[PDB]
């Protein structure tokens, strides 16, 4: 075993969730920060994690839920601050494609390992 940021495994779960939702018809719009400021990346990560739970609840699918659960545990293992940041509900609502693309963008900021 060698040491690799947990966030690498988060991207692998996002890829998996994206693949799994492709069959289904999940049509929630979700709060999306597509341009995270480094000074607010914890606040932004927290929003992504919250909204990810909506994808799971609305899917009603065991595998999506397991994969969301695995992601959130990894991410919380990687967290635990910041000021002047937007609340989640101030963010644009975007479709699931755009949401997940932006999720990948920010997970990538945290591999640095920022």
């Amino acid at each position: 075993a060698m040491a690799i940021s947990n966030w690498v495994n988060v991207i692998s779960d996002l890829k998996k969730i994206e693949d799994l939702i492709q069959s289904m018809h999940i049509d929630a719009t979700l709060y999306t920060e597509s341009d995270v400021h480094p000074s607010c990346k914890v606040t932004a990560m927290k929003c992504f994690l919250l909204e990810l739970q909506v994808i799971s609840l609305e899917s009603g699918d065991a595998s999506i839920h397991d994969t969301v659960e695995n992601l959130i545990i990894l991410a919380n293992n990687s967290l635990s601050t910041e000021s002047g940041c937007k609340e989640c509900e101030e963010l644009e609502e975007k479709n699931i494609k755009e949401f997940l693309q932006s999720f990948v963008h920010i997970v990538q900021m945290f591999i640095n390992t920022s």
Binding site: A28, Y31, C47, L50, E51, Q53, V54, L57, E58, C88, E89
Partner: peptide, 10 residues
């Protein structure tokens, strides 16, 4: 009013 993040309207 805004949907609270993490909550679902479905």
């Amino acid at each position: 009013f805004k949907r609270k993040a993490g909550t679902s309207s479905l």
